[PDB]
Write a protein that binds this ligand. Sequence first.
Ligand SMILES: Nc1nc2c(ncn2[C@@H]2O[C@@H]3COP(=O)(O)O[C@H]4[C@@H](O)[C@H](n5cnc6c(N)ncnc65)O[C@@H]4COP(=O)(O)O[C@H]3[C@H]2O)c(=O)[nH]1
Lengths: 176, 176
Amino acid sequence: NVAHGLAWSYYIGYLRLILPELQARIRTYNQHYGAVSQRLYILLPLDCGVPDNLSMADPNIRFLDKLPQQTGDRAGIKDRVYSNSIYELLENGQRAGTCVLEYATPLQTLFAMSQYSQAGFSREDRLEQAKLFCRTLEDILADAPESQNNCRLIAYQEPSSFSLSQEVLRHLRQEE
Amino acid sequence: NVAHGLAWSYYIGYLRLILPELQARIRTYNQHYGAVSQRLYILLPLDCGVPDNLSMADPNIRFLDKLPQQTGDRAGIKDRVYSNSIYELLENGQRAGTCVLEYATPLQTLFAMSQYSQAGFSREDRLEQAKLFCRTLEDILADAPESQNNCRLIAYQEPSSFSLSQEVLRHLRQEE
Ligand SMILES: Nc1nc2c(ncn2[C@@H]2O[C@@H]3COP(=O)(O)O[C@H]4[C@@H](O)[C@H](n5cnc6c(N)ncnc65)O[C@@H]4COP(=O)(O)O[C@H]3[C@H]2O)c(=O)[nH]1
């Protein structure tokens, strides 16, 4: 249902545009301005709980700097700019990884819609619409020319205690 | 169908955030840095044809400057910035108006989706999904606290010759 269009909007208006120029932006940040690994990691909490300050979700996740901004004219707005944050991940008090990680804001938009009444989005459908957003985005990236070893999806569901740093590092470790 | 979620995403992730701080940004541009009128005009072509360079849609529409950028932390991206362009509108070779006008990029996203095959969006449904995006966005703004005399929707359908400058000025004139 609604998650479909949100996934496609997420790809057509963002991933399709930044992923091609991401590895250049990363190569520039390592030099010009550990190293920052060459992939954008997208946090997909099925909870749809998308904090704005990441370190408050897990203190072991600590913001370090921003990438060199990428700009472009998009729909009559001169120099619309896409920014991306670089984060360090801690494990027992030491830097265990560094990557460009960020939440999927459509999930934050699925949350909000589930509370506006006129949106006709019953709030019990949150978890499924979240699941279809992941499943849909996943199939778009399977056939995406822009995604040629350039972004990794981190879906997860907090059941007690949970560590999102460990969650990320795991995906980060499995690539080496 | 899909236009619904695109309208809500357009409001929850954008209008709801910039409209509150728009009149401050405009008052600042008139002074600090005709005058720029205090409203964001959103071009909704039912054609869904959303050029990126506006002046190429109508040369009488000429870009002048940008507003003072507005920033905020959104979903783990530090200092995600919202920019908006200020345009001058000509009528027989003279400045007849000045406003913050921009296309609705969801319409550009409806176009693109109508050509990706796996998006399951038949391209004959473009005009209707465009019509439901306007009708839906219109009802969201009727009850929007953030929209208290702060943005005006410019829906239109090119049938021959057409002038989008004249189209805009008309809405601009009717407010005086
Ligand atoms: N982190 C990030 N994500 C972005 C950026 N641009 C797009 N995205 C992602 O793609 C979605 C759809 O983008 P869109 O350009 O097709 O429609 C956008 C666009 O029409 C409008 N919008 C948001 N930020 C804007 C901006 N800075 N300038 C102009 N329009 C903007 O609101 C819609 C929904 O935004 P959203 O943040 O909830 O979801 C984004 C967002 O998840 C971006 O610059 N940064």
